Structures are given as structure tokens and as C-alpha cells.
Symmetry: C2
Subunit: 289 residues, 2 copies
């Protein structure tokens, strides 16, 4: 008792934790005018039953691919022994999905959040027959937003007009670059960069964090923010890469996807990027697409 | 590039469950202001991404006093023999609940930490709040799923069924009943089947977050909606020990306004058994 003592339609592909995280983050900020969650699991699982029960006003859950029609953004969150076999399994899942989703939303931006992101973005590009500017992966977007917060807020470091980005291939080995001027000591900038990078590298990347970074990218696209994000983008022509690979590059994002790749200062950065391009390209060559 | 081919709500804990509650509450616009208390080692930067994301009405803090004047305080924090594990959880609550109760003296305390029955009792003891304003998530998620299973998965004619008692793999159900007479055997068969469908399902952080947000909705908007929540069960089912079990309650601005009357033998048997075992564990805890 009382005793004491335009209508912005967005499709999230996948009803797993990442798909749910994207859905909730997008809904939390009111980014979508309407949101379709494509639940592609076995029906018996009832993977998204709780979301149906919760009944978000502008959210529709469906198992029908055609429910995604006329989307502004289609977000891929789905995922499947040896490395090549595991990647091939993911590729094969995308092969049965991307062409249909591309058909249903022919003017959308395709946003790839499935891993390994560089290969999966390339695969999505090849399967959709979309222009490269409208196919992007989450790349090092989360890394970059965190790194910038680390420098500004954790380290309270004086950075003057210069912005820092994590670029290239997503992984434990991380590559950074600066875009901006006030003259700064090379030694001090390297020391700052190394320190902020160490702080970043120990952090995990859980589904909720990825969902939040995805929602922010969708925000930029649907509202034509022209905000810079480091995303997986077609890297041929940059850093003397002559192969068709997607690496994370700082891009201006808006209604038509990537509007511009911004220039950064120019060497180990090129070397690491070319090495990534080489290994990614070699793995793409042995995949069945 | 071109080429082709004022309702203030505090969430206690910044772990996955705390985040899930925060996002679910924000998604529906339930909170006017939301404070997320990040009680981890600040070195981990547990909630950094949520700060970066910058939800308009969300404040992240490590300061307990930032929770002051909340309408609802949600406990999502958690954490070797079973008694030692629960004791560590109790000890964490001992350093927390009394301060949060002090800072929001007129709030409803909503306990989402496990084992929920014991942790709700502990929160009740530590806060010195009236029992109606201390509730646990109990079997709320179970109940909402079970009703959805019957109505939507089984398309069965009947919403008036609740999962009650102690949260666990072996579940107890009860019906409110009405003027329409139904065959006992048919109702038992329906219940067993829906219960099996429910029992194979997991309860992930995102699912619990959604069910929590819905309960917060009922409280802060005074919905007077029935939820099966962990509530002081003394007086019900011949239990005269102070234990919290999940009972169907009407929730509103002052927490539990009424425990609804539900069904006639095995249900009481299972409830008394749960009451006894829970009470035994409470007696051996240091509170
Ligand atoms: Na809906
Ligand atoms: Na904020």
C-alpha cells in the first residue's frame, strides 16, 4: 500500500540490435518523416515484436521489401569459418537484397553499416547500379566524431580552424589527417594526434554507438546539412589509388549523397592508405559478386 | 563520384540498458527533461557518444544532485555464489538509492536491475518511500508480449491475461475474466500454447528499454494503464511476508493506485513458493 520501511522516408534494413539502435536513434531526434524497419529474420523469431508493441507513431515494421519503396535513405545493418568464406556469406546475403532495394528506391542514398564496411560498400555499389556518390559506408565516421570530441572536450586542446579526421580502412590500426591557417609546431601536433588516437583506440564500437552515428549521417543527408563526415567512399583518384575501392574520406553529405570530397594536408598517410587499397582490392578479386 | 559499377526523468546507469531506456523515452517524447546518470569510471567515457549525438532535452551527468526533482527515477545499474552476487548489487544500491530518494522525494522509483523482486524490496527499504512509489519492471515485458502473442500471433478471440509472480524461465499467468463463459480446457490449452511461445524468447536490453519507457509513459501522463509490475505482495495470495512480486497494477502520477483483482490453486501455490524463497534470501542479505 502506502507503507514505508517532401516526405523523408527512411528504410532500416535488418531488425537485429544494430537495426533497432538505428531506428530508435533516428526516432529520438525526429529525423524521419516515416521509417520502415525491414525485419528479414525467420518469422517465428518475432525479432521485432517489442517494437510493434511499443508502437512508435511514424514507424512501420515489415517483412516485404516493397514496403521500402520511395525511400530517401536505405540503411544496411544486416550481417551473416575462414575470413574469405565469412565475407562471401555476407556478400551473398547482399546479392539477394541490394538489387531489389535499389529497384524500389531508385533515387535513394544507400548507407552501408555492415562489416567489413569497405568491401560491403563496394559490393552494394556494384549490385545497385547506383552512382558512386549515392553509395556510402559508415567508414570511420564514429572514429572521427569521437576523435574530435576527445581533442576538444577530453583534452581541452586549442585547435584553431583545423579539423581532424580518421580516414582509410576501419580497424585497430587507425589513420588520421588534418584539414586546415595558424602555424603549429609539427612535434606538438604529432604528440597531440598520437595521444588523442590512443584514447580513441581503446574504445569499443557497440551497436548503440553505431546507431547514433548512423542517425547523424541520415540527418545530414535528409536535411541537406552539407556537413563533413568521414565515410566509406570511392577512393580511386585519391592518394594515387587506381583501383575501385571504398575507403573512409572526409565528404560533404547532403540530399544527393556525397557532394564533395574535401582536401586534406599532404608520407605515411598515403602509404597506409595504398596498403589498405591493395589488400581490399585483392580480397574483392577473389569474391564471387 | 559519378561512376556506376514539467516531467523530469532520471535514468540511473549509462550501460546498454540505461542507453536503451534513454533512447526509447526520447523516441516517444515522453520526457520534458531527461538526466542520464553515468556512474561508471569516467575514464571509460561510457556515454561519450550520447553527448556527441546531443539529444535536445537530454542531460548527461556524474553528479547525483543533477537528478533532483525527478518525477521518475529509473535504476538500470547492475553488478561467485548467488548470495555474494546479489549482495554486491545490494551494496551498490545502498550507496545510491538513499541519495536519489533524498534528491527526488516525490518521485516514483522504477527498478529495472536484477534480481528484480529483491532489488525492488531493497530500493523500498533504502529510500523510505511509500510502497506505492517503489515498483520493479517485474513481468511487465512478459505480459505485454503474452497479450500480443494471443491477439496477433494466435489471432485468438479475447488483453485480460497477465504474467505474474517471480520473473524467471518458469512463468505464472492469470486472467481477469469477464461475463462471457469459456471452456476451462480451451482456456488452459490457449494459455499453455501462448506461454510456450513467450518462454523461448530472450529479454535483451533494447526490449527492456522499450517496456520501461511505456511504464514511464503511464506514470508521467497518469494513464491509469494496467501493468504487471513488482509490487509489495503482502496481503495478496495469503502472503504475509514483505516481498515484491509482479502483480497487475494501475499506474499513474502517484505510482500504483490500485492492484486489480484477477482466477481461483496452482497459481497461489507458485506465488507462495516464490514469496518464501525470496523472503529467505532477503533475510540472509545485509541491508
Ligand atoms: Na506504428
Ligand atoms: Na543535450
Amino acid at each position: 500500500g502506502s507503507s514505508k520501511s517532401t516526405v523523408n522516408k527512411i528504410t532500416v534494413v535488418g531488425g537485429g540490435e544494430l537495426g533497432i539502435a538505428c531506428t530508435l536513434a533516428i526516432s529520438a531526434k525526429g529525423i524521419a518523416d516515416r521509417l520502415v524497419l525491414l525485419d528479414l529474420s525467420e518469422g517465428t523469431k518475432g525479432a521485432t515484436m517489442d517494437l510493434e508493441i511499443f508502437n512508435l507513431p511514424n514507424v512501420e515494421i515489415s517483412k516485404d521489401l516493397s514496403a521500402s519503396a520511395h525511400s530517401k535513405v536505405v540503411i544496411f545493418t544486416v550481417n551473416s569459418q575462414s575470413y574469405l568464406d565469412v565475407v562471401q556469406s555476407n556478400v551473398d546475403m547482399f546479392r539477394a537484397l541490394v538489387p531489389a532495394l535499389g529497384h524500389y528506391s531508385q533515387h535513394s542514398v544507400l548507407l552501408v553499416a555492415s562489416q567489413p564496411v569497405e568491401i560491403m560498400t563496394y559490393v552494394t555499389w556494384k549490385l545497385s547500379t547506383f552512382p558512386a556518390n549515392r553509395v556510402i559506408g559508415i567508414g570511420c565516421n564514429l572514429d572521427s566524431q569521437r576523435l574530435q570530441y576527445i581533442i576538444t572536450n577530453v583534452l581541452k586542446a586549442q585547435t584553431s580552424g583545423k579539423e581532424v579526421w580518421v580516414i582509410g580502412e576501419q580497424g585497430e590500426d587507425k589513420v588520421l589527417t588534418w584539414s586546415g591557417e595558424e602555424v603549429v609546431s609539427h612535434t606538438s601536433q604529432v604528440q597531440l594526434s598520437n595521444r588523442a588516437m590512443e584514447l580513441l583506440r581503446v574504445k569499443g564500437q557497440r551497436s548503440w554507438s553505431v546507431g547514433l552515428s548512423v542517425a547523424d549521417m541520415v540527418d545530414s543527408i535528409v536535411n541537406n546539412k552539407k556537413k563533413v563526415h568521414s565515410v566509406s567512399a570511392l577512393a580511386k583518384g585519391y592518394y594515387d589509388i587506381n583501383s575501385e575501392v571504398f575507403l573512409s574520406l572526409p565528404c560533404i553529405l547532403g540530399t544527393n549523397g556525397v557532394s564533395e570530397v574535401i582536401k586534406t594536408t599532404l608520407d605515411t598517410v598515403t602509404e597506409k592508405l595504398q596498403s589498405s587499397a591493395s589488400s581490399i582490392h585483392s580480397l574483392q578479386q577473389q569474391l564471387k559478386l
